[PDB]
Write a protein that holds these residues in place. Sequence first.
Motif, mmCIF file in Angstrom:
data_model
loop_
_atom_site.group_PDB
_atom_site.id
_atom_site.type_symbol
_atom_site.label_atom_id
_atom_site.label_comp_id
_atom_site.label_asym_id
_atom_site.label_seq_id
_atom_site.Cartn_x
_atom_site.Cartn_y
_atom_site.Cartn_z
ATOM 1 N N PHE A 70 0.821 -1.205 0.000
ATOM 2 C CA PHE A 70 0.000 0.000 0.000
ATOM 3 C C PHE A 70 0.857 1.257 0.000
ATOM 4 C CE2 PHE A 70 -4.484 -0.932 0.331
ATOM 5 C CZ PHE A 70 -4.500 -2.279 0.626
ATOM 6 N N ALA A 71 1.980 1.237 0.718
ATOM 7 C CA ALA A 71 2.875 2.388 0.702
ATOM 8 C C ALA A 71 3.466 2.601 -0.684
ATOM 9 C CB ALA A 71 3.982 2.210 1.740
ATOM 10 N N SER A 74 0.890 3.901 -3.070
ATOM 11 C CA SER A 74 0.674 5.336 -2.916
ATOM 12 C C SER A 74 1.848 6.131 -3.469
ATOM 13 C CB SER A 74 0.430 5.681 -1.446
ATOM 14 O OG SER A 74 1.575 5.413 -0.657
ATOM 15 N N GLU A 75 3.069 5.610 -3.317
ATOM 16 C CA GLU A 75 4.259 6.309 -3.785
ATOM 17 C C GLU A 75 4.330 6.371 -5.306
ATOM 18 O OE1 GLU A 75 7.369 5.884 -1.131
ATOM 19 O OE2 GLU A 75 9.034 6.347 -2.482
ATOM 20 N N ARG A 77 2.501 7.925 -7.187
ATOM 21 C CA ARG A 77 2.187 9.265 -7.668
ATOM 22 C C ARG A 77 3.452 10.044 -8.004
ATOM 23 N NH1 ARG A 77 0.755 9.542 -2.737
ATOM 24 N NH2 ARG A 77 1.311 11.763 -2.730
ATOM 25 N N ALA A 83 -3.519 10.896 -8.788
ATOM 26 C CA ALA A 83 -3.907 10.490 -7.443
ATOM 27 C C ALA A 83 -5.310 9.896 -7.405
ATOM 28 C CB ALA A 83 -3.806 11.680 -6.490
ATOM 29 N N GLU A 84 -6.200 10.326 -8.302
ATOM 30 C CA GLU A 84 -7.563 9.803 -8.272
ATOM 31 C C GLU A 84 -7.592 8.319 -8.610
ATOM 32 O OE1 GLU A 84 -10.335 11.605 -7.292
ATOM 33 O OE2 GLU A 84 -11.186 9.580 -7.238
ATOM 34 N N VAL A 86 -4.999 6.234 -8.166
ATOM 35 C CA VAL A 86 -4.346 5.552 -7.053
ATOM 36 C C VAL A 86 -5.336 5.318 -5.917
ATOM 37 C CG1 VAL A 86 -2.533 5.754 -5.322
ATOM 38 C CG2 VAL A 86 -2.068 6.423 -7.687
ATOM 39 N N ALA A 87 -6.186 6.312 -5.635
ATOM 40 C CA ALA A 87 -7.176 6.179 -4.568
ATOM 41 C C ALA A 87 -8.127 5.025 -4.834
ATOM 42 C CB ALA A 87 -7.961 7.480 -4.418
ATOM 43 N N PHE A 90 -6.524 1.642 -4.070
ATOM 44 C CA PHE A 90 -6.633 1.249 -2.670
ATOM 45 C C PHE A 90 -7.920 0.476 -2.425
ATOM 46 C CE2 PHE A 90 -4.068 5.292 -2.013
ATOM 47 C CZ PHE A 90 -2.875 4.609 -1.894
ATOM 48 N N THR A 91 -9.036 0.990 -2.942
ATOM 49 C CA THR A 91 -10.309 0.305 -2.770
ATOM 50 C C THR A 91 -10.288 -1.056 -3.443
ATOM 51 O OG1 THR A 91 -11.428 2.445 -2.714
ATOM 52 C CG2 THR A 91 -12.778 0.481 -3.082
ATOM 53 N N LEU A 93 -7.548 -2.961 -4.209
ATOM 54 C CA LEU A 93 -6.627 -3.838 -3.499
ATOM 55 C C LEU A 93 -7.216 -4.299 -2.174
ATOM 56 C CD1 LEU A 93 -4.057 -5.269 -3.059
ATOM 57 C CD2 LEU A 93 -2.941 -3.113 -2.509
ATOM 58 N N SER A 94 -7.890 -3.398 -1.458
ATOM 59 C CA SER A 94 -8.409 -3.744 -0.140
ATOM 60 C C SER A 94 -9.478 -4.827 -0.232
ATOM 61 C CB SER A 94 -8.969 -2.499 0.545
ATOM 62 O OG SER A 94 -8.024 -1.446 0.521
#
Lengths: 262, 313
Positions: A70-71, A74-75, A77, A83-84, A86-87, A90-91, A93-94
């Motif tokens: 996850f880090a 996020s990196e 970017r 960023a949109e 990438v956000a 997260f959803t 991947l989670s």
Amino acid sequence: YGLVPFGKMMGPWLLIRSALAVGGDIATALPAAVALECVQVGAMMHDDIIDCFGEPTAIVGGDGLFFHGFAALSECREAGAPAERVAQAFTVLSRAGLRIGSAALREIRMSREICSVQDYLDMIADKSGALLWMACGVGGTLGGADEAALKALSQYSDQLGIAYQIRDDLMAYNGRPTLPVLLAHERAPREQQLRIERLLAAERKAMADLVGAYDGAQAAREVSHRHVQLATRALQTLPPSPHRDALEDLTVPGRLVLEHHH
Amino acid sequence: DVPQVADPEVAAMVRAEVEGRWPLGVSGLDEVVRYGLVPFGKMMGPWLLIRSALAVGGDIATALPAAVALECVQVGAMMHDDIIDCDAQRRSKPAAHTVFGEPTAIVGGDGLFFHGFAALSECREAGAPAERVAQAFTVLSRAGLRIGSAALREIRMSREICSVQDYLDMIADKSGALLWMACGVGGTLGGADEAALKALSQYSDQLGIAYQIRDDLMAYDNGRPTLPVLLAHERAPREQQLRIERLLADTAAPAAERYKAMADLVGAYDGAQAAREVSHRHVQLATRALQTLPPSPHRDALEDLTVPGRLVL
């Protein structure tokens, strides 16, 4: 044959091809692969425990690798990822990890008894299908995939995972259920069902004898081929490209048994 | 003087949100998730994140799902840490692996972790810009790496003399990172500028050190070395230093006889009081860092958390 089988069917190639198939940039997919590597290895280290090197390292290191993924995701970017997207990754991947966890729990609770064929299929779609969707869902999302494309990769991921888990069930030819045994159960009269159930319930080389005596192995192959077609069907939603071609061949045992060993 | 911003009911709103997400009667994976979460308890981590977000002008609606994320991540880490933990001081509740088995506890910890990641993803829909949601995940993950590394070192460094600074670094990762996960994510989502985050970082490390020292002190009011032991060794003469090192060094001695041997030497060189003064210094550095934040009831709440007996982890 075709593209020679290589072994070790993992996310790095699924993720990168998924990103590029939808128009993504390699500069983001490369560090994302490092991010996906972490989460998948962490899922590996936890899987090694539940099917019974050091216990603290296997648990905590697996946990830490989730954070690395996850880090590093996020990196991406700083590599240039919007960023949109990438956000949303997260959803994506989670929720995949939630499927992997939910499935492993069923693996623990289902053993030594017959479940429905559909129950087994849903389980492996979350157990191994989500493992692939971690690659495709993240890659496609970072590549800028449309909702239809992401759903397409979702079907492709699930159907591919079902198939290859079946193909691993075929190698044998806890008492955990596999599709060959389950489909053998469906065909058999009550007299033969009772035998299948008591065996799930080293010497019990026994199970191999009763499976072979009642056509366990043969049954699952055609099911595997049905899902192979649905995975290739899903890819056609994507635009033609060499990336889409690379994904299509992975339905036929594109890598070795070494992938199931990997 | 007068408040210009509100002071909300953080503790109960968090509990109501978590109960809503995993209520009584859930089955499947959420049953194991819920077992780790209940009884809810104080939940000071989630409370700390929301106060940190509000201290910098953030939104409750943005910080709340991040608060849920925190609880899941920290309970998941606890569920896995219980598996590798051996001692149980009867001040505890039955471990998930003793109840459901070790395989289920591993999956359950994973379910908590990804429930955390999923909850933090909800911050985008709550109104946080995608740029801040991504930065929150970076903060959360790095903190998660510090808490894990410390747990492994707690197991590895125990029963051997380490430098006092080495103990300080460990406890800064064990307890300071737990706070930084709350403050750092809260401030990031709250929109804190670069100076505010470093202030919250300093507050997290300093308050975490103090909390840990205060907990080391309870034995002096697991048979592992703590700061009073380390401070006692520093003050003791060389002949006494040898004995302190050999008692730690060898893992084959009776625990009760080991403990009293350490306790007499801590008492002989005022290790308990010496630990208090170290703790008091770091409490003051924690309140110092807070002054970078603007005055608010939320900043007052963070200072009140340095008061003895207020912070519970």
